[PDB]
Amino acid sequence: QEIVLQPRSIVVPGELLAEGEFQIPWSPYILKINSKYYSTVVGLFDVKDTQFEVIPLEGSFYYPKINDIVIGLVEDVEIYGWVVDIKAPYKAYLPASNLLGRSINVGEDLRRYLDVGDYVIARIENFDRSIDPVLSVKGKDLGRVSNGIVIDIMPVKVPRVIGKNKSMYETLTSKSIFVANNGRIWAFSEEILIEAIRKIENESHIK
Amino acid sequence: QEIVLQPRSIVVPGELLAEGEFQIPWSPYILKINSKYYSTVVGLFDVKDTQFEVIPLEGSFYYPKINDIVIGLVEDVEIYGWVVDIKAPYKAYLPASNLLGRSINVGEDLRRYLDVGDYVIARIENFDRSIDPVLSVKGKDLGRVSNGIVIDIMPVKVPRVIGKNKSMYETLTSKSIFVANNGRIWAFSEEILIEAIRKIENESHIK
Amino acid sequence: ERPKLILDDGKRTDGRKPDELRSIKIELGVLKNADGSAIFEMGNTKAIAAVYGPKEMHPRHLSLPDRAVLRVRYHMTPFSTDERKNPAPSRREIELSKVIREALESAVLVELFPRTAIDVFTEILQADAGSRLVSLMAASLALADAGIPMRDLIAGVAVGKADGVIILDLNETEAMWGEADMPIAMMPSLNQVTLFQLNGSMTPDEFRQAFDLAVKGINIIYNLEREALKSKYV
Amino acid sequence: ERPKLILDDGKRTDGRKPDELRSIKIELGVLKNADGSAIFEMGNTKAIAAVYGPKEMHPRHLSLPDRAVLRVRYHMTPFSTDERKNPAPSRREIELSKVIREALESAVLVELFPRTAIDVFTEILQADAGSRLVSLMAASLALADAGIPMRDLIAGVAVGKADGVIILDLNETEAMWGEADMPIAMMPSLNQVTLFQLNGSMTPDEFRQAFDLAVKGINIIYNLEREALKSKYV
Amino acid sequence: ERPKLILDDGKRTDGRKPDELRSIKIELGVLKNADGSAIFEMGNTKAIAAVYGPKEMHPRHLSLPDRAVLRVRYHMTPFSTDERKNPAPSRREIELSKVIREALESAVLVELFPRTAIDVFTEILQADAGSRLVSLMAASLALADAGIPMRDLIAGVAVGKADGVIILDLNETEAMWGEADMPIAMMPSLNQVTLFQLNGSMTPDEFRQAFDLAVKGINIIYNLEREALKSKYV
Amino acid sequence: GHMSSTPSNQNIIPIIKKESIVSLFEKGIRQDGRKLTDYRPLSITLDYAKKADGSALVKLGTTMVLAGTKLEIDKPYEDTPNQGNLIVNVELLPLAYETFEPGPPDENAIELARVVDRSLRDSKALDLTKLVIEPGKSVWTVWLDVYVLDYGGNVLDACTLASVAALYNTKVYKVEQHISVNKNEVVGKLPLNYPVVTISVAKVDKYLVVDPDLDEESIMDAKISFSYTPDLKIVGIQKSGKGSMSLQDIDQAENTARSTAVKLLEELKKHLGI
Amino acid sequence: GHMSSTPSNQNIIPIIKKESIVSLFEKGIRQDGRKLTDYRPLSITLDYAKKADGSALVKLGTTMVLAGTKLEIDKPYEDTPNQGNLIVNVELLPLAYETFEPGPPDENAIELARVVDRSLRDSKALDLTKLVIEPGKSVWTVWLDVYVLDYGGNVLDACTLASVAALYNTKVYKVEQHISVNKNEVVGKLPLNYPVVTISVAKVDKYLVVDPDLDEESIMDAKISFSYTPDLKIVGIQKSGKGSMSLQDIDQAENTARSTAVKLLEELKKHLGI
Amino acid sequence: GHMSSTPSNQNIIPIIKKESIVSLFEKGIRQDGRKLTDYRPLSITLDYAKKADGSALVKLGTTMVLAGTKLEIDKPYEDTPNQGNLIVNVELLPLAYETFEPGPPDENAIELARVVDRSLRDSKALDLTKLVIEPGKSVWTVWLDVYVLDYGGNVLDACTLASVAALYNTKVYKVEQHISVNKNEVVGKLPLNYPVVTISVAKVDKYLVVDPDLDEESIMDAKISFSYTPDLKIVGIQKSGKGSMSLQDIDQAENTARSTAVKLLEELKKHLGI
Ligand SMILES: [Cl-]
Ligand SMILES: [Cl-]
Ligand SMILES: [Cl-]
Incomplete structure (x- = not known):
């Protein structure tokens, strides 16, 4: 049957x-x-x-997919790169060469590029069950974040927040927001959109 | 004197x-x-x-010699290679580049090449007192094993099992077997050669 | 031995029939930090569980290349028992942590998360028999609350023998004074046993009678576990 | 002090002369998993040893670039002594593990295996004096059984003083009640002392008399060790 | 409570006025191996400290990318107290090690040495009240002796209340029998408090009176610390 | 042998988030809309742990603490023949926070237990001379075990509340002379003089904040806690954290803590039924 | 504080070897030619450890276990004035297997001790009321220490055999009233009602195997152990290992274990001289 | 469970430095100009630790050891009703050397304590039968705690000196019968028969050196220590270190140690006032 x-x-x-x-x-x-x-x-x-x-x-965790757009948080700075937290079981690594378009130099690395506590918008350039995810800053409007609020959510909820044909994405923009695959959204004055984007988590199953 | x-x-x-x-x-x-x-x-x-x-x-252990032919057992799979057990004090490493004849690719590595629990026939391409042994699959009839029995022995006994002018090697083939330097032999139906190749261990000193 | 465990009405010391469960109460999402959490109460036995995970494990050499590692703790609070329990882990707690982990190993789809740890912590707040099972079921529910994929939920109950009568879901008086106590847990939809122990003594026919009665209780419990998990969405 | 240790026949409490060894029995290849193993009995003192090694050591920072690391355990079973011994390592066991390791360090050709550990575990099954030496000699034999290259085997014996008489290979009564107890072990073909301790008290002339008597015993023991190792091949 | 702490002359049991310090003695460079060292005596309370550092830390995952890690031990010798103290760390020692480390964290310029540890070990040789502060000040001095850059030295003293009188720098009788004991340490040139605790009880006005008196003592001590450090060069 | 080491940040917060947290401090309010002097919502559930002699589950915001007591008969210590005993244990359960691991109490849990113990003892709230059964021969030992189930910030103040509530909730059982405890007969409740509270004030740049949450604890310079009885005597003080504070900050902090204590004591008394 | 973690494979066996191990299961036999229901060869050497009050060295295949007892006089516990004491300790010696490290008992050795202890206790084989010297005042404590010297598979069943044999072998010494133990005079042997056995059944795909060896343990799905007295009452059950089994597997396993128990009890009795 | 492992070199010295250290051995002198048989400068400060019952600070070269005693009243052990007790503890403080970490005594500190304890006991210097207050009922326990504050080589001999000096320095307080100790009245000093010394001889190639410093310890093949009373009985011997020595080396070493002992005992007696 x-x-x-x-x-x-x-x-x-x-x-x-x-x-x-x-x-x-x-x-x-x-x-x-x-x-x-x-x-x-x-x-x-x-x-x-x-x-x-x-x-x-x-579920509170994000499972890396190659070429996902992701907003992470820098935690460690190694010799030749930066360890990044993307709310996954595995932590991501942004290579220095990728950021610079060239090799690290003999006394390089302050952190004016990226330090601990910086938010980064980035894409996953490599990932499989055998290795931790690798980040790339290459694309347009990737790299470090300077301004704005960053709102954390269940990665499980990301598709509801965008919605059918980005309908949910529309009805938020016009109310007063970039929605990453990561369960994190980068975002007028006194914009309390957060109080509404928490309500989508609490009612996604409904209607 | x-x-x-x-x-x-x-x-x-x-x-x-x-x-x-x-x-x-x-x-x-x-x-x-x-x-x-x-x-x-x-x-x-x-x-x-x-x-x-x-x-x-x-003695139960094998001491690596460069260019020895060795049948190991895969234990770990790292990002860019496979950790292998050859009954030595040090564990051996088979590089991916060596197996592929080319570099690993951006999302490569299932294990159809080699997974944990696979037997591999291989040669030691690098070893000294300063580093762990490095394996190569390059030669003919190296690489993964598919069929057959693999019999483990004291590496100390390997020269007796082959024998003078491969005499002991002959008197086994014709009875019903590849003999590595490793104290491991890769090998008709109901071939209980093992029961005889254990008897060589127990009488090598005799006659 | 000392108190009568089966009374002349054929009922038990707490008024139950031999084939009757204690009352059950389940709460989910009880803790804010935990990735998942649950409180399970079966009669006066009460456990809380918290789950954290998939996350990378720092002692890489303790990680597994093809699977997540489950890390599990069964612990009783000092005030959970009639007489104060010393908070240092006992040999009992060490054994039960292992038996509970191995039960969960059959259910959790650990091969989804190579090189990670999934942490499972349970605490007995009140112990009135059956606390290993109440712990295990709180852990199962907490893992579901955390969104960690599993083959099935785990339901369990202890059967036993008291004054010669085969009985379902023992209380502390029966556990202490009865002739046998046999905790069993299953993945009920898969027909698979995940935990199975007996202490005391039974004949082989009594053992089969008891196993059969346990399955009936487990099936009731399983449905309550399913309904509890669905309740917030419906 | 309490019992007479030298009797009017000039013999000892167990019938031995001052220059006589207890009987010795050696068995090799006693354990299947161990890379090498041995049981050594000297009178009623009996030790078993197991060896595992050369193998890479996981805490790389604990390894040595030019040598293998020896890892050694001397332990007594709870039922090896007249009164039960607590199984937790004692300060005595900690000291003796070190003294035994340092004896073995002189013999084992550790520089053959950089960055490895050779593990040596010994257990006292019956303690009737001299157990540190019986342990050390079982370890030596077990290392030979494992095919781990060494400069020489180690043979040892305790000499001492009892009711003023210098005596060879003490029993427990003499160790407890005598005036001095001096364990000595050597690589006899190399003329080298690997273990040397005295407890109690001796004059400098008594010390030299005792050292001389120990060498005579050691040489006898050494030959028994050689013959034991050869026995299966001849 | 038991002995009179303030006598009819208005003086204390050791003859001091309420606003008077015990005598102080400081020695520096007391140990050869330590990178820096000091002995501090305040009355009959005496501590020795040793410093080792900046050095790379082996458990790299325990290191910090932007700062040195301070590693600190407060320990009392068994013979430092009226009744023998067990040498195993007590809960008191564990608490005080943390409070002392956190005081030092405000002073030591740890961001100069990323990925390193600075080790600070202190031992109480004689305890007659105030030993946490005497420890902390010996550590401060030992760090200066080691050439490890700091914002300021740390000076501290305990104020309290005895038979209703606010008093400076308690002795053991006052610490044991008084109504309150309040250790305070500062970086005096920076106007910053690094350690602050009270045990016992005070009214809010008494607390302010006591805090004020502590500052007066601290300033005296600070000058002695400065002079001690300069003394070998002048 | 043991030693205290600087920890890793177990809650590294992004620069951007710090600015938001403190953004409304000028107006006297926080993230959650509470005033700089307000505690988070408090619930106290007595007799939560049914086999405890007394117990209390405290929820303070997202912080959850379960305290429970068990009483035993002991011979008194030789130096204190006329007093019973109080033993305080706090555990920071690995359930409570992601970076907590199981093991015996670390220095943070040891510090908590010892700060709470002192505040209870030095407050004179629990007069141990009341715990004597037969002078010199038999006294009550009160084991107080305090379990932090959910670490949401300001765990000290929640531990004090739970500890006081559990002690108030403690049943005393009849003692039978032959001496035995008969648990079928409750003859008393543990005798307390009054409640105590601990009030924690965090310094965040130029502001002082009462009852810091997890985020506020992650950005604060230092914190100081002050314990009060209803007469507003100070019965314990503990500065905690890596940073320093000025004499003036401490003065201001105490004045602010004491104002809050009055209100907290009142609310705790309602919860206790006294 | 403590926790149980999934271990690494300490005997990773190659795919090819698994096929061989199970190759003759269709014909009802194994690697070594034994039937699926057969134990490996068993020897039991009594009084092996000469300073033990009783002892037994058990060899079961390549598994070797030495059990020994020592008896001491103690005041009985207050709740059990009319019983002596039994204390069971098992150690998995680092001699026994390559990946064993020295340390206190890990969870595997603790589990072994506790499974054996229960089987001895719940079997009623050792009636602790027989260990009383002076009711309420003096009783025997039996320390049972069980050392696994060679880990060759099915260590539980070897530990039970060794434990029962050592207890049977235990000498009881004369007690002299002044109370002292005079070790020059053996007045008795420890009194046992009967022997007990534990029978371990491993599930290997569609087969059940009695007395798994090292290789079989390395490939099994799970194992279950059943304890029996001579009347074939079940006196303990323990499922062990990572895998699950069906209700039907457990039923079949018990039926198979019980059939084997009859034969094992008979052989053990010959070894004991009863 | 525990085990002894080969350590890392915690003082790797360059080839070039070894040659210098031994460069003047032909002339019978060392680095510091001392003869091969000379101890470094020794100071002994009695009553250094003022709350100890007795104490001594020993400086031997750059080695510094503080020993202290505390006496307690105890019931004697059942097997020794007519003797008091001596308990020796040595700690190698993390203050003392850079690679020392805090923790309980490692095998080196345990060995030190046990070598010192034996030398004190077997010397008969401290007759424990003199420590009885009421036979069978009350005796003195002497806790001896020996702290190595600065590890500069030959810590064993400094520990023995400090231990003997602290014991000699030990005050005995009046015992009041009601039994209590009245610390306001010193009635005695701990009774010793004589001092003891330990003498350590290091083998450096073809030379034997008394009282090795840190550098000499870093290059020596092995070391052997011999304990003496004033009659020059040998009262303890301990070979230590990784290397072996010949029978002839040991013979020569003892002869050399004993010659030095005479002088060291004399100097120690001056320091003690006996
Ligand atoms: Cl249970
Ligand atoms: Cl010995
Ligand atoms: Cl203090």
Whole structure:
């Protein structure tokens, strides 16, 4: 057979989603055991076309994907680069050569480039299960942040904050915000958008 | 003077072998103290021509020699190479560049090349008292093992298993086997050669 | 031995029937710092758990190339027991931390996070029997609250024998004075046992009767665990 | 002091003459996992030793660039002594582990294996005096059994004084009640002393008499060690 | 409570007036190995300190990228007190080591030496009250003797209340039997407090009276510290 | 042997966040809208730990502390035949914060226990002479164990509140002479003279802030804590942290702490039913 | 403070070796030619440790365990005036396996001691009321110390055998009233009701194997141990290892263990002279 | 569980420096101009630690050791009802040398304590039967704590000197029967039969050197220490260090040590006032 057990339901680890042999791409949120598919997380069952997925409702960590745009926080400065925190299980590394467009020089490195406590907007240039993520500043409007508020959120919530065709992204800009894959948003006076972007976390499952 | 104290004898640490000034190449199994030579191991005193040696009868470890052919076991996979166990005091490293004939690529390294628990046949391309041994897969019939039994033995016994003009190697092949320097042998149906290649360990000193 | 454990009405000292569970209460998201958290109460036994993780592990040589490492602590507060417990870990706590970790190892999908640690800390706030299971189930729930992928939740209960009667979900009087106490935990949807211990003595037929009764309790508990996890979204 | 240690026949409490050794028994290759192993018995004193090594050492900063590091443990089992010994290492065990390591440092050719550790573990199964020496000689034999190159084997014995008589290879009664106890170990073919301690009191002439008697015992023991090691090949 | 602390002459048990310090003696460069060292005596309270540093720190992950790490030990010898003190660190010693380190953190210019440790070890040789301050001032002096740059020296004294009288620099009788004991240390040229604790009880007005009296003592001590450091060059 | 080392920052906060935290201090308010002199919301749940002789769960903002007591009969110490005993232990549970590891109490938990113990003792709130059963022969030992379950800033003041509440909540059981404790009969509550509070003031540049949260603790120069009884005697003081403060800062801090203490004591008394 | 962590593999075995180990399981036999239900060769040498009150050296395949007892006179615990004491310690000596380091008992040795202790206690084999010398005043304490000298797989079952054998081998000495122990006069042997055995069953894919060796332990999914007295009551159960098993696996395992127990008890009795 | 490991060199000295150190040994003198048989300058300051019952600060060259005693009343051990107690502790303070870290005594400090303890005990210098107050009921316990403040070489001999001097310096206080110690009344000094000395001889190639300094210890092959009473009985011997020595070296060393002992005992007696 090939059958699905649920509509748009709230899902829990171990919950049977479907029986049959579907041709689903592998996901960390679904566990296939022979002809049965189970959720591995607290989440929202989502059927699209003939395939299905589980959307996680829970989780504080970001899983690196190559070429993701990410806003990190510098923590350590090594000899030839900067260690960066991107709210992942693994910490990211921004090479000096990447920032400079050239090799470090014989007595280089104050920190006018980047010091501890600086926010950086950056893209993941390398990552797999065998190595920590590598950052690149190359693109436009990447690099250090100077001004603005940076709001932290569940990376799990990032797709709701942007929304269908960036609809949620629109209805925030015009109210008074860059949304990274990282669960962090870089952002008028007395802009208390934060109080609303926390309310999206607390109601994403609703309507 | 220049005299030898023993014929083909079983030898023990501290045992005086010879008095005089012989022109012997240095060996870990013989200790020269001015005009006296002593065994450092449980072994078999062997006189050849005008020189002498001690053949060790004891010892579970292999001492790397450059260009030795060796069958190791992969244990760790680092970013740009594989850590390998060759029954030595030091663990060996097989560089990725050596295996690939080219540099690692930006998202490379599953393990279809080599994973933990794989046996590898390989040669030692670099080693000295200052560094751990480096492996090379370059040669023919090196690289990963797919099939067959791999039998572990005292590296000390490797020269007896091959034998004079590979005589012991012959009398095994025809009975029903690659013999590495490592004290490991890669190898018809229900071939219980192992039960015989253990008997060589238990009688090498005899006849 | 000393008190009567089965009364002439055939009921237990706390009024329960042999096949009846103590009341259960579950709270989730109880701690702000923890990546996930839970309080589990089964009768007067109460545990809190906190989870932190996937995160890189500093002693790299203690990490694993293909898996996350689970790091687990079962600890009882000094005031959780009838007589004060010394806060230094006991041999009991050391054993139970291992048995609880190995139960969780079967459930947590650790190979998703190579070279990381997932930290699981549990504290017994009130001990009235069954605290290893209440700890384990709080940990399971806390891991779900943390969004850490697992094959299944873990539900567990202790069965045993009291004055010759096979009984479900022991209280402290029964654990202390009864003839046998057998904690069992499972991944119920997968039909898999994750924790299994017996202390005391049972015949082989009594053991099979007890195992069967445990499964019935586990299935009830599992549904409460599922509902608790869903409750905030519905 | 309390019992007579030298009887009117001029013999000792166990029937030995002042210049007589206790009986010796040596077994080699006693353990399967250990790279080398040995049991040494001298009278009712019995030690087992196990060796593991040359192997790379994980705390690289604890390794040595030009030498192997020896790691050595002398430990007594709780039931080795007349009254139970607490299994936690004592100050005595800590001292003796060091004295035994430093003896072995003179013999083992550690510069053959830079950046490695050679691990040497010994356990006293029965203690009736002389256990530091029986430990040291079991370790020496176990290292030979492991094929780890050494300058020489180590043989040792304790000499002492009992009721004014200089005596060879003390038993526990003599160690406890005698006037002096002096353990000495050597690499006998190299004429070198590796361990040397005295407790109690002796005149300088008594000390020289005792040292001389120890050498005679050591030479006997050394030959037994050589024969034991050769015995399986001949 | 038990002995009279203020006598009918209005003087204290050791003959001092309420606003009078105990006698002070300072010696510098007392140890050969230490990079810097000092002995400080205030009455019968005596501490020795030794400093080693800037040096690279082996557990690199314990180092700081922008600062040196201070490593500090306050310890009392077993024979420093009226009744023997057990040499194992006590909870008191653990607390005082932290309070002393944090005082020194304000003074030492640690950002001059990224990724290093500066080690500060102090030992109380005689304890007659005020030993945390005598320790802290010996450490300050020892750091100066070691040539380790600091913003200022640290001077300190304990004020308190005895039989209702606010008093400067307590002795042990007053510390034990008085109503309050308040150690204060400062960088006096910078007007900055580095250590501040009170035990016992005071009214808010008494607290202000006492703080004021402490400053007067500190200023006297500071000048003695300056003169001691200069004395060998002049 | 032991030693105290400078720690790593376990909450490195970005320059930009510091500016926000202090942005409304000019107007006398913080992040959460509270005044510079306000505590966060406080709840105190008595008898939370049912097998404790007394207990209290304190929630102060996101800080959570569970205190519990257990009483035992002991022979008194030889030097104090006419007093019972109080033993204070604090643990900073690895549940409480991400960088906490399990192990015995570190220097921070030891400091907490010792500051709380002194404040209780020197306040005279718990008169240990009241804990005697038979002079010279049998006294009560009060074990106070204080567990920080959620580290959200100002854990000291929450530990003091929880400790005082647990002690107030402590049941005393009948003692039977044959001597045994009969736990079926509650004859008393632990006798206290009054509550005590500890008030922590953090210095953040030119401002002093009462009841610092996690973020404020991450940016403060130093902190100082002052303990009060209801008569507003000062019954303990502890400066903590790496930075120094002026004599004038300390003076101002005490004046500010004492004003807050009056209100906190009042709220604690409501929670206690006294 | 303490915590349990996933270990590294201390015996990483190559894919190829796993296939060989299980290659003859279809025919009901293993590497060494033994049946899936057979123990390895067992020898038990009593009185091996001559200064122990009782002792036994157990060799089970390449696993070697030395157990020894020492008895002491103690006042009984206040709650158990009519019982003596049993204290079980197991050490996994660094002699025993290459990756073992010296230190106090790790969680594996602690688990072993506690599983053995329970099986001895709950079996009722050693009735501690028999260890009383003077009720309320003097009892025997039995210290049982169990040393794993060679770690060759299934150390639990060897530890149980050695423990039971050492206890059976324990001499009881005359007690002289003045109270002293006179070690020149053996008046008794420690009184046991019967022996106990522990039987460990490892799950290796679709097979269950009794008495796993080192290689089998290195590839097993999980293991479960069942303790028996001669009446075949179950007197302890412990699932160990990282993997799960089904209810049906456990059921089958118990049935298989119990069949083996009968034979093992018989062999142990021959070794004991009972 | 514990083990002894080869240490790293904590004083790696350059080839060139070794040649200089030994350059004048042919002429019978060292770096500092002292003869191969001479101790460095010795000062002994009694009653240095004023709250100790007895104490001595020993400076031997750049080595500095502070020993102190404290006496307590104890019930004697059951096996020794007619003797008091001596407990020796040595600590190698992290103040003393750059590579010393704080922690409990390592194997070097444990060895020092045990060598000193034996020499004191086996010398019969301190007759513990003299420390009895009431036979079977009350005896003195002498706690001897010996702190190495500056590690400058030959710390053993300085520890022995300091230990003997502190014991000689020990005040005995009046015991009041009700039993209490009245510290207002000194009735005695600890009773010693005689002093003891320890003499350390280092082997540096073909030379033997008395009282090795830091540099000499850094290049020596091995060292051996011999303890003497004034009758020149040998009352302890300890070979220490990684290297071996011949029977003849040991013989020569003892003869050389004993010659030095006579002079050292004489100097120590002047320092003690006996
Ligand atoms: Cl439980
Ligand atoms: Cl010995
Ligand atoms: Cl102080």
